[model samples]
Target chain A: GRVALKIAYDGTKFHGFQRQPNVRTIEGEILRALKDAGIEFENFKSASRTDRGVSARGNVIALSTEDDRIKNPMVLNSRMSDVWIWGIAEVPEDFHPRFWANTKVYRYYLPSLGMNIKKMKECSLLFLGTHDFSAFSRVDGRDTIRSIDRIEIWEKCNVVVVEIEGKSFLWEMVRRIVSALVLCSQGVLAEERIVEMLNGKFEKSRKVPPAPPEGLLLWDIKYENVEFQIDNASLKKFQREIVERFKLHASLSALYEDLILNEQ
Target chain B: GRVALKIAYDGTKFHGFQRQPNVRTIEGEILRALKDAGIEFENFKSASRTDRGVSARGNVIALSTEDDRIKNPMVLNSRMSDVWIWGIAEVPEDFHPRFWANTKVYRYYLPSLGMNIKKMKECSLLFLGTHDFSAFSRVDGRDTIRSIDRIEIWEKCNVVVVEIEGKSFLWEMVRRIVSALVLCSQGVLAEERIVEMLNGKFEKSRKVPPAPPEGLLLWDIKYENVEFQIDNASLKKFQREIVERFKLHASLSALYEDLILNEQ
Candidate 1:
């Protein structure tokens, strides 16, 4: 049997999401946990290989197993105590997680202070549709032309959240685009400058500074046709508890501040 | 002739405040500008040497000049447009900027949302008096027994400001303390952990992480006996304009947020 699992984790604790030889990685942890649950995996694949300190909320992975250990959602959920598991579903044996993904969604967070959002938005416009992003991607002998389906810039409190959706991205492509946008927003570079570099009109003299890895989050992975077998009753209850706890923390933080200042 | 100048700069553009050989540094830029102004100098002394990407609002420097071309304060200020010269004053020839009788005050800002202020305040009590901060400082073969006269934590909107008044500090000492304090406030580390480390009970393997450079600001510098010579007319007018501009920006930001939410 084959199963697809939607996963999320705080990447600060691991090298990255990809499995590496003799390294503590997110994939390694997942595999270990599954094996411990009496599941034998003949093969495994991930939708994306995120860098160190990069978080994800909707990363997808598929694996083959002989044991029906994961048939019970409750047992599988319990096994994922160490790693965050958001959802689970059964997929066709031949359906590849990476190739079958309709769209990969990523979000980068930027601090509000000292950033010019208008310039960032303008720079993002240059990245729309399709173009050779060689100047904005790590050149690893792979094609740099990746189509961006959508990009949305919004403000959540004091954070500027930039959500990008695409079919797929080359190595470090997303990070580079984020870097260029941030630099442009800070008035360090111009939109036309990036366009010229992309068009090969200008030589690549300067490197795009990688934005802080902690601010990026793989928000979601989109799939076609196959409906996710979600245990809504359990998920909704879990979500409610987590949300309440978060609200309580917020309220307590506010109370502490007021108490300290002796204010209402 | 000797002169003392109060300076401020956006340090993100340069390496650091010290002049390093063949390096584009803040001190190097300032010295180059001075040389272009025809001011021959053997050496210039700064009250403190800030790290890379660390900004300052009140950095003091004293320079001795053989040529009388650098006598006028107005001419020196006008010549140096690359760096912001907040104020310049005539000082005694024997005055050394670093050895001057005074306290160096530093304010470090952190985002208040994810931090536990109550825990942070409790942990701050461990740093209120003079202590050997060798465990908390960058070991650069220098003395680390700094007398921390006062330490205070307060909130201004979304910013958690930690202000510390001390005689002097080891390299990256303040930032290290601020980082540890933040972690402690977030309940990542115990509130008494700082005291344990300071008391030499903790193992050398345990070390506090350094906070990001962008949030730390050298807000002010103080000098004893030597009164700050202020041009009241110009100072008052400039202060008024800055306050108005700051208010305008805040209001405009709020207006934009309201418009986005489709609210009045």
Candidate 2:
């Protein structure tokens, strides 16, 4: 049987959503949790990659397993922490997490530097249509030419949010695009330089590198009307904990501000 | 010189706001920072107490110092980590922070438990006005008859917020009061039971203990238009970070829900 599961994670505790030999990663945690539950699959396909320190709310993963228990996400959820496989669905043996997806939304939260939203809008357009985005993505030996359906830029809570919606993405493509926009907004590079990069006028090494991993997130994934076994109640509880965690941190930082005023 | 200061702290890092003889505490952090910065005060009075796992946003503390350099809060901030002391003001030699405060606002953030808000609101009114809340406060050997100007319980972002405002609070009084309301909301106790408890149906020894300290916070301290030396810009930036930190924690929590779902 083939099953697809929706997982969420804190990337600060993971190296990325991708797996590596003997290194910490989102997939590693997932696979380990599965193995702990007496199921092991040599290979699994994930819908996205959230880099080290990045986070994801609804990343998808697909694997072939005879274990019907895996189809119920809660059963596997019993074996993991930080990562919970909340939703699961039966899929064709050949169902691919990446190829079968209709769209993805990758969002970047830029620090509140008072970025001009209008300039970010212009920057988004430069990367909207199809192009060889080799200069804006990691070299993963995949086809560098990619098409972005749209790029939505907006401000939230004083931070710039860039929503990159696409049929698929190259490795680290969204973050590099964000870096370009931030650099353009700060006058580090001309906004039009993004256009030149699309046309292969310069090497990726010559442009602003990807944004810090912490600023990026794999926000959502879509697979045409796919049904999953999800526990909304548990997921809701998880969401509340995160909000509380962050607010606590903020209050903490506020508290520490006055502690060191005497000269550290 | 008598100096008044605004202090902020995350109580999760300390046993309590009051300094203990040989343990980590908020006041201990402040005194150590002050001494480390070459300013030592024999004693200081804080406007309020945040119990174990509690927190504060704008608690006030005042001390008499022979060294004028203690007025510079940034000098103390550099010497502390979990606690911050800022917003200094010159006061009369006899000024006391707790006695000088005209009003205080203590807030409690309750986790989303689907508690009946209507019931909680009714419970808030029972403790208002002057009441001898002997059963709802700890034994500090002070006064158990306390006066609360008002108690406001509301919902924000699916989080239950209870704001208790008064001239002063009894030790752990807010937490116990909140615990009783929570019991009423869950049908474990009737709304009128709060009045019974206040009337001593349940003695202080027989009453339910206080709520967990993590959800409680000392939100603010107000004086009779007393001016404190404050850097508005520094405080503002610190505030923005707190809001941003919470949202990040929410998104991060969402990400980890699927990373590993285990009891651990």
Candidate 3:
């Protein structure tokens, strides 16, 4: 049976989750790491195709394997940069990560923009249910309609996190949705205007640009039957050692924030 | 008349704190901004000459100014990037920031390295009092004697902050001391060796190289007589404007951190 591995990556360096010819990318690096770790899979499919600088923590990849040793994620992690394998799981013989995924969760973080949650809530609620979100996506005739299970907006320390959970997403859909919300917040467009755009009642120039990729994160993908088997020891070797390394930066940032922005 | 200004900088982009020919540097940017702000002084002196990639939140600069507009720190701040003027004051025409500073606080934050506070405290205390620290420094011909008022080591999250407060420091002096201390922390050297190095009883090759510049910060420069005037409005501009700009990264980092570091 093929094995599916859950993986995480810091996307600052990769072109994105998709493989491109001659360009460094998340998928290429994964394959390279696997080869270095002595397991080479000619073909594999990923659950999500993240854009450049868009990070993901819980995307899965499934492929035929020569041995179970490929399940040792560190073997691959040791040979790569800014990416990690968090778990391994066995899937049905015909399983593919993308086709088998039941749900995917993505989050976009933007400046609170001084926008009130009440107004944003009303605007975001319109994204729920099945809609032909043509304006919210970049399309190539694959159908722009998607059933969004939920759209959530919340604040944490002056940042607004817009989380989208759905069966799937159209290209750049979440980013454009965020851009429109930002426009709504800045009063550039009325909240009702988004519904009009969704109805395909606008000029081509009236579209909102997608949010920057740095703020977009593919947070997780779900499969009800697939309980991931985490290789805890292999997964933790780097993560455990670097927590303080990272916290040092976090505190320094907090210290700077206190000194410049928040300090009296 | 001369004006002394307190400033902060993100040193990652600068060549160093000093003015250098045909290179980007903090002093060059300061001078450039002063000219662009219409408050130029050909020659200026800074309290600390930090190397590249070191940051500073509290450093002072003194320069002769023809117009009082230079005293308005925001004028210069607006023209600079990654540098800010937080406090402003008029100094005696002859007052120099370096000469007038009574004590300079330089801090080094590094990995915990599994070194205990008891050992760190003991090692740090040895640097206090007037000593011939030639071995702990990087040069010759200059008098190698200096007074270190205090050395403090404390834990902040998983990192250790080593703070050194003194009348002044030699070229790369603070970083070298930190490197020696880290060696002690890792059990590569005995604690007594630092005291011997301070006392000028050390071998030449045994001199530890200085710690890298990224982790060092010129924390504060103090002068009892020269009181600084704080700019409440300008300081608040940065603190308030982009809570999300920074927190976005913080949350992004935290989002990734939880996925790989703390996930069950």
Candidate 4:
């Protein structure tokens, strides 16, 4: 039987989501934990490959496992560190975690720092609908055309949040789009630059630099008619850990505010 | 002449603020940076010794250096990592970073997990004025009597911010005080338990555990008639870095919020 699990991780803790021979990564950590749990499986697959320092809260993975005990999310979550599994589902053996998704969601967090929000909003509209994203991606061998269903921009506290929903994205596509938007917002690059880039009229030398990976998050991937069972105890524990993490960083933010003000 | 520096660091990056033989530390990094810059120094001393995972924004240190160029805060700051030398002052040869302070300030940031703020405030008052804080400290050979001139508690966002001011503090004293307040606020211990502990009526068997170190910050140290010279460019860079940091964590906090809400 095939089992699917929804996992989350702090991206900075792992090299990336994909397995590598000489690095600590999300896939490596998962395999190690599964091995330690004495679980046997085949045909392992994950919904998305997150880059280094790119976190995810609802990344999905599927594997065939005969050990009925390992199917319980809490049972496996207890043996893992940094990575967490909170939702599980038993699926048909033919299920593919990646291609069956209806939409993929991503978010980028930027410190507001005097960005021209009106210009950013204007530029975001250019990213909607369909376009050739070759200039906005890392130029992999895969097809460069993609579709974006939604783009949202809002301010929460002193940070600007950018959320994008799409069927899928090219390698580094969203980050480069973000780069273009930020540059346009700051008035360094004109809005027509994004238009030209999307129309395949941009030079390779003047490529948009993808935003840093740490500020990006793989929010979730949605699948129609696929319901995941939640592990209540594990979910509660994960929430507490997140709160502690939030407290540490938020407090540091406050202290930094004080330090900057004291300099006055 | 001895040069004094007000330093700040993310505590999780180093072992602590004291020099250690086999681990990276705040003082050790400072000394290493100094030695690398072909500088000579002697009689090095710090305002306080912070434990592992404890951070600070205004911990102070004084050292004698013959190279006049090193007196510029920017010059020394450029050579350091993790530890930041933000504010610098020139002091008399007899100046000691620890003993000549007018007051020291500390803050502890705790997540407000359904705590009774009223009861915490009621317990905080017992810590004011002079009392023997032996039970609240990891007692050493030094006298355990201490006075806290101020203990302020306030709720900011979802965190409880605790600020304490005194001439000096015993090791782990503030953390234990916080532990007591939190326990009392949650109804696990009575406010009178703190009264008995402050009055030196408690036994070692039930000593309050010190709160975790990462939440603690040495906010500042005050001295009469001493002004620190700031490096404007370096200070600006530091603030930008802090903003980026704050944005990352704050966004993670928001993402976690979304994840929890989705689970419901």
Top DockQ hit: 4
For candidate 2, lDDT tens digit of each residue in B61-118? 8888898778667677767665666577778877788787578888877644357888
Which of the CAPRI classes, incorrect, acceptable, medium or high, describes model 4?
acceptable
Cα lDDT tens digits for candidate 3, A1-264: 588888877776798888899899999998887777777564587888888988877888888877767867777877887877888888877887878857999988664535666777777887888887888887768777788998898875435789999998988899999888777766777867777777777666756789888778788888878988887776676476446445554444433443444322
- For model 3 the local lDDT of residue A67 reads 72
lDDT tens string, model 1, B223-255? 776655554433333334333333322322222
Candidate with top lDDT is 4
DockQ of each: 0.03, 0.09, 0.20, 0.34
Task: Give the Cα error of residue A66 in candidate 1, in Å.
Answer: 3.8
Candidate 2 chain A has its poorest 10 consecutive residues by lDDT at A255-264
Q: Higher-DockQ candidate among 2 and 3? A: 3
lDDT of 1 by residue, A83-152 (tens): 4565778888987888895788888765554568887888888888887877877778877777888988
* Candidate 4 per-residue lDDT over residues B153-191, each given as its tens digit: 997654688999999899998899999999988888887
Name the runs in model 3 displaced over 4 angstroms.
A37-40, A111-115, A185-189, A241-245, A262-264, B19-24, B28-43, B65-80, B84-90, B101-248, B260-264
| Residue B227 in model 2: lDDT | 77
Return the TM-score for candidate 1, rounded to 2 decimals. Answer: 0.49
Quality class of the docking in candidate 3, CAPRI style: incorrect
Best by TM-score: 4
Candidate structures ordered by TM-score, highest first: 4, 2, 3, 1
